[PDB]
Amino acid sequence: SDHRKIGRDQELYFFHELSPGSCFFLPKGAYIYNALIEFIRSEYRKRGFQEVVTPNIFNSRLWMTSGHWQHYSENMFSFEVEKELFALKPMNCPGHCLMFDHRPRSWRELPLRLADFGVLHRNELSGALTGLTRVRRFQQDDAHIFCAMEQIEDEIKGCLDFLRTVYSVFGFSFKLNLSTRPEKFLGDIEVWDQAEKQLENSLNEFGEKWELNSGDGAFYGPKIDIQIKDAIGRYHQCATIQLDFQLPIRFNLTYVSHDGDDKKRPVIVHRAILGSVERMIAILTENYGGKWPFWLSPRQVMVVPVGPTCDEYAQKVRQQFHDAKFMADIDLDPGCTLNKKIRNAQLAQYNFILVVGEKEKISGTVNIRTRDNKVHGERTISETIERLQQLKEFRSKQAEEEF
Amino acid sequence: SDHRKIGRDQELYFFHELSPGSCFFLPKGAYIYNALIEFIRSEYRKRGFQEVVTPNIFNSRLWMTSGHWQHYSENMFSFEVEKELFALKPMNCPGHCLMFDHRPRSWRELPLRLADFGVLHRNELSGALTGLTRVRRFQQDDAHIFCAMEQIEDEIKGCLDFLRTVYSVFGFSFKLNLSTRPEKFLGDIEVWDQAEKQLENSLNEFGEKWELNSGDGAFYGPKIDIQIKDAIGRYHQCATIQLDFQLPIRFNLTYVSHDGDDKKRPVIVHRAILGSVERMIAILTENYGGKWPFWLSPRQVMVVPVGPTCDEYAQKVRQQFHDAKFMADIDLDPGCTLNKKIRNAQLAQYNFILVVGEKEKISGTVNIRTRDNKVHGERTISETIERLQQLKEFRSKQAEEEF
Ligand SMILES: C[C@@H]1C[C@H](C)C[C@H](C)[C@@H](O)CC(=O)O[C@H]([C@@H]2CC[C@H]2C(=O)O)CCC/C=C(\C#N)[C@H](O)[C@@H](C)C1
Ligand SMILES: C[C@@H]1C[C@H](C)C[C@H](C)[C@@H](O)CC(=O)O[C@H]([C@@H]2CC[C@H]2C(=O)O)CCC/C=C(\C#N)[C@H](O)[C@@H](C)C1
Ligand SMILES: [Zn+2]
Ligand SMILES: [Zn+2]
């Protein structure tokens, strides 16, 4: 089960030597892409996240401040503009630190959750590059939570909840591990201790088992790492919750508290769930075997007529399903058998096959078979649309069966 | 007047030393961004356009093939990756040419309209840079039509229609210009002749007033230039329709005709309407004077309660408007006058101010005032939401008046 082959055969995405580590998404794959993105966006609008758009290149002084030239230079594409150094952003964080520092901010605005889907480029060796799993270019579901030390606990709760929701939609399971302060660390030990206290507390509060790795954290902060398990029984590292006490210092971030102190530093929480959209597309592709849930599927409805007798009506049907914002196609080919068309639609992984006969044209109705050839028998166009939009909006895992 | 200042005061967008020629979009400005993108997308789905996702960086051989090295190299950021030259994409065209050549294609698949919102980088001199008007990083509403020479006529009709529709929503006028074959040109004269014939043909068919700039066309094709006029009386060059015969040659693109003849070349139509999203954001900012139409507005509804007595009933109201996918805020400050709150809300360019009193909490209603201060008096939450939804969907140029 390979996402590259399945990628080619469904005309989702392909690859080319002219841009190694970067992907070409054909319209269907692009649909899947934007579908994932807007899923995350809906959840954002539930959870109080605010999306921003940031520059893709920056002067060397920013990667100076952030710690990227000292630490990350190898992975970064750099070039010289007007005698000054510039680089493509490997991460969204420093830009967001700039957005936070744009104007004086008070305690009233915290927690401030800034989200970015912006394009990230990382330099990775040509022989290391494979498919969508290891890539140079990717879009990440990225967010930074700026908060007071004390809000952190609640924030983490939210974070965990967020994860659950998303993965509950995919049907994935997950494992949690707490990586605490290592021997090599930068910061004030008190800050570390309170932070880790809150992390542990919200972890227990969450109610699910976790392991404590004791010193496997980073030098700039403690972290909660999350492993997801798919239906094939594969384990993936996708989501992350990473605290940062360093970045607010390096960029000199401050906020007004309620007791008047304006010199207070915030805590930065780097958070991601899907990881990168690309790698998540790979994972989902292999996990589903190319057989997509209705809400995620670039091929949703396939309209078939019984004969040229009634194409006019298939056309009207398909159009009515198109304006309902479904991905819907039609097979008008006179040189094909009805059974052959249905079989091809089911091989093309169309979730629902709507067959139209004479009774179908006369009564203003459609007849329904499924990708797995279940015949849900005859329905009104209105009813079919309503039920399908229910199964879409709720992102049902098996739609065909539950219809 | 000036979009930079307005961008600062409304917390839409700002600029920074560390990335000249790029932009920082705060949540509000970002909302505007994605709103424009979504508008163009809806119209795409009406008009049979298919969106794709393409790589941001490419090997130098691509830019050599398309001809950007021998021409456009001065505007391109280039850098070395593993001994080889690479560059960020100034345009989406070559990538789309790659996507066309991915597999064999027939006449049945034409016209094939591929759309890209992808991020483009062009190198502009630091002294040339001003705001969002002249930039380095920008996202373009970009599309390439691949069509048979004949279909071109009909296609242009569509293009024209599309322009009209979009600008009908904005309220801009436009003047049309046909730029034809220059003295220095590359191609077969007969191809040029037929193409220009069809162009003039659809131009007259459209019913609008167009002008003939014989000779001022590109060396690689004839073009229709469009100038938009706003409400300040400024003319802008944003939208373009550009024929390309050269690109299919250089990338060796073919298609199976219904003859059985596969050696026929497609014509490429480069098309943009908004130009770049950034440019259009600037234009709209200065055109609206920072006062946005209801559908484009990051500040739509502000809920104001009179007394803390019902701070909470407004919590409820603002929540119900938030789940209707409106951009809605609330003013709970006990240290402010009702009047001061209202006029602050209108100075902030909030489209609708919902004042909430005791009677309103009792009868489950709201009382409506307007950014310009009109007053629509009590109305129930339901019909208020429905009316605002209609005014959002139809994209009313004035919601405030027509509510
Ligand atoms: C610039 C260095 C680079 C470090 C050393 C990178 C290491 C490889 C790990 O620390 C990476 C990591 O987990 O980053 C984390 C990313 C979130 C998912 C992961 C991701 O995007 O991969 C986030 C950390 C961002 C950190 C910073 C920033 N800015 C830090 O202040 C600076 C000091 C970090
Ligand atoms: C490499 C040259 C660049 C030309 C010489 C530069 C000129 C300034 C204009 O030709 C640019 C232009 O109007 O391009 C047009 C762009 C659409 C809006 C405009 C836009 O994006 O600005 C479209 C043309 C793309 C063209 C190609 C490609 N690929 C051509 O085959 C090659 C020859 C283009
Ligand atoms: Zn981060
Ligand atoms: Zn183009």
Author numbering:
A (entry chain A), B (entry chain B): 321 to 723
Relevant lines from the article:
Aminoacyl-tRNA synthetases (AARSs) attach amino acids to their corresponding tRNA adaptors with high specificity in an essential reaction of protein synthesis. An angiogenic role has recently been identified for the class II threonyl-tRNA synthetase (TARS for eukaryotes; ThrRS for prokaryotic orthologs) that is distinct from those of YARS and WARS. TARS is secreted from endothelial cells in response to TNF-α and VEGF, and potently stimulates angiogenesis in the human umbilical vein endothelial cell (HUVEC) tube formation and chicken chorioallantoic membrane assays. The isolation of resistant bacterial strains2627 and Chinese hamster ovary cell lines with selective gene amplification demonstrated that the principal target of borrelidin in bacteria and eukaryotes is threonyl-tRNA synthetase.
As a first step towards understanding the molecular basis of these effects, we co-crystallized BC194 with a fragment of human TARS comprising the catalytic and anticodon binding domains, and solved the structure to a resolution of 2.8 Å. The structures of BN and BC194 differ at position C17, with BN containing a pendant cyclopentanecarboxylic acid ring, and BC194 a cyclobutanecarboxylic acid ring. BC194 binding to the TARS active site is stabilized by numerous Van der Waals interactions and five distinct enzyme-compound hydrogen bonds. In addition, BC194 induces a conformation of TARS close to that of BN – TARS complex, with an r.m.s.d. of 0.62 Å between superimposed BC194 and BN – TARS complex structures (for all 402 Ca’s in TARS). Interactions between TARS and the C4 to C14 moiety of the macrolide structure are conserved in the BN and BC194-TARS complexes, including hydrophobic contacts to the macrolide ring made by L567, S386, H388, Y540, D564, Q562, H590, Y392, H391, and F539. In complexes with both compounds, residues T560, R442, M411, C413, Q460 and A592 comprise a binding pocket outside the macrolide ring, and interact with the C17 cyclobutanecarboxylic acid ring. The key structural difference that differentiates how BN and BC194 interact with TARS is seen in the contacts made to the respective pendant rings. In the BC194 complex, the absence of a methylene group in the smaller cyclobutane ring lengthens the contact between the C17 carboxylic-oxygen atom and the 5-amide nitrogen atom of Q460 by 0.9 Å. A strong hydrogen bond normally found in the BN complex is eliminated, and the hydrophobic interaction between the cyclopentane ring and A592 is also weakened. The loss of the interactions with these two residues suggests that BC194 may compete less effectively against threonine for binding than the parent compound BN.
